[PDB]
Copies of this chain bind each other. A is one copy, B any other.
Amino acid sequence: EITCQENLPFTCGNTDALNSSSFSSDFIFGVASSAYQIEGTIGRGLNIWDGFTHRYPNKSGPDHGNGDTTCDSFSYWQKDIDVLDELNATGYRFSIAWSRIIPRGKRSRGVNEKGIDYYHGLISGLIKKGITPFVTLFHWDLPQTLQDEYEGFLDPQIIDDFKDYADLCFEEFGDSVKYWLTINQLYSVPTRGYGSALDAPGRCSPTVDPSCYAGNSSTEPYIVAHHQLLAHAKVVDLYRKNYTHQGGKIGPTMITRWFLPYNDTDRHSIAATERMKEFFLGWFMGPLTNGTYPQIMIDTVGERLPSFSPEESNLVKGSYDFLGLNYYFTQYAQPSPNPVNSTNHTAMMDAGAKLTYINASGHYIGPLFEKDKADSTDNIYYYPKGIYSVMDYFKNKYYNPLIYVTENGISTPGDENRNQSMLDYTRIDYLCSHLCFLNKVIKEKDVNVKGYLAWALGDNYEFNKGFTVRFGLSYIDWNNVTDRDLKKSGQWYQTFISP
């Protein structure tokens, strides 16, 4: 019988008690990255994260940081491989920058051979060290040209441009890459990119944020989400019809959270909690498992919710071999009004829920996850049991899928000096406590989880935060980015992997 801790102090950093041998022999352990966050702009065209961070520097991070140079994995990809080799990792998730291989967006405009060569060399280097690549086609970095031609995922033109990009990736890299992710965190671009305008491309209703160049936060999230699902599904169909000889697997990436009632004896909070599951997870998992959006979304969102045709429904339903599930934290849910006629209405209001990290009796859900220095009542707290609850829910609700945990990690402040930054015991605690619950759910609930990739390989540009936080298991000096030095967490993870 497995017992796992939910509160500080944690004792799962002892590899005598928790290590890779606790999991099945074939289980993959590694780390993750994304292209905007690590590569730099050298050698690629411009994408909407370049555009957004440059047009709206205060939205890029408090330091106005961006991905222009970052950790320079364009130059230092071998050093990334070296970290993975030091870890004895068996997996690495990275993304392909669309703008590096097709700078002009549309494949018929030509490819960048040198960009293709960059990923060939990375892939070959990984495989030579026994590391399985997990490759994200689209980690938010849409070529700027496509956003300017037709507003990107706002328009159905995205589907064929994404398909042709993906086809090039399968053609060039699929002989070696056997695990593909289509779109990173399906929920995020619709809501943050087109709802709150916290993320690229930065569209919203005028009264939500007067700096947005255009948008409608009530309608566009739904349009974009719908196009994401269709573009994803078209790529999965292309993969499974035209690249079956490659013997690989493909799936989407979800951001997952668990949700608990703010007041577990209040029917209204219980209802809000179940609505959140539907609106947060079901928005995408309903289509992916059934070809339809959840009924509560149909009912609430009404004419703002697009319909799938019968052909589209069939294309989207079942459009995965596995799910990449990202998991960071859990929220309490309580009811909230949905003012659909307000000029500041957002899609996110349609769930009719307010989310907190403290429940009605004043209980904080778990240890600190992210401090918010401008408003401490907005601090985020984590909840290790949430990974158990999410995986159990996916198994039970969503037809026992094959799952890889494609991100899980925690930040430390960029204000810490290097010695403090390397002494990242809070990261060991977060990672181990989640791994304990992941082992527990696999054993107790028989969830088909076959790997775990911690966020992040190394310090990088963090969307929305610049270089003001660090997520890496290895440390990068922003004054001299060449080295990636394993932190205490990376050293712990090395021991966990090879105990």
Contacts and interface: CB of A to CB of B under 8 A. Distances in A.
Nearest to A59: B42
A146 to B, nearest CB: 8
B43 A56 contact: yes
A66 B64 contact: no
Contacts of A114: 211, 213
A400 interface: no
A491 interface: no
Contact of A54 (B57, B68, B211): B68
A197 to B, nearest CB: 14
Which of A40, A42, A69 has the largest count of B CB atoms less than 10 A from its CB? A42
Interface stretch (A27-35, A104-112, A291-299, A470-478): A104-112
Contact of A148 (B41, B64, B105, B214): B105
A424 to B, nearest CB: 30
A148 B54 contact: no
A46 B144 contact: yes
A69 to B, nearest CB: 7
A195 interface: no
B54 A46 contact: yes
Interface string A42-57: 1111100011011111
Contact of A144 (B45, B109, B151): B45
A224 to B, nearest CB: 16
A362 to B, nearest CB: 42
Contacts of A190: none
Interface string A299-325: 000000000000000000000000000
A2 B44 CA distance: 55
A150 to B, nearest CB: 8
A44 B40 CA distance: 21
A343 B54 CA distance: 38
Contacts of A214: 110
A161 to B, nearest CB: 11
Nearest to A74: B57
B45 A55 contact: yes
A404 to B, nearest CB: 32
A147 interface: yes
A51 B64 CA distance: 18
Contacts of A45: 51, 55, 144, 148
Nearest to A72: B57
A151 to B, nearest CB: 8
A55 to B, nearest CB: 5
B213 A112 contact: yes
A88 interface: no
Contact of A44 (B55, B66, B110): B55
A46 B51 contact: yes
Contacts of A148: 45, 103-106, 109, 143-146, 148-149
Nearest to A56: B42
Nearest to A48: B46
Contact of A40 (B57, B68, B110): B57
Contacts of A42: 54-58
Nearest to A44: B55
A478 to B, nearest CB: 14
A145 B201 CA distance: 14
Contacts of A64: 69
Which of A46, A51, A112 has the largest count of B CB atoms less than 10 A from its CB? A46
Contacts of A112: 213
Given A64-B69, A144-B148, A214-B110, A50 B57 contact: no
Contacts of A57: 40-42, 68-69
Nearest to A64: B69
Nearest to A214: B110
A59 to B, nearest CB: 10
For the complex of A and B, 6 pairs with smallest distance between CB atoms: A145-B148, A41-B54, A104-B148, A46-B51, A145-B145, A144-B144
Given A145-B145, A148-B149, A149-B149, 15 more contacts: A40-B57, A41-B55, A43-B55, A43-B211, A44-B54, A46-B51, A46-B144, A50-B51, A57-B69, A68-B68, A104-B148, A110-B214, A144-B145, A145-B147, A148-B148
15 contacts: A41-B53, A41-B55, A42-B58, A43-B211, A45-B51, A50-B54, A51-B144, A57-B68, A103-B148, A104-B149, A105-B148, A112-B213, A114-B211, A145-B146, A148-B148
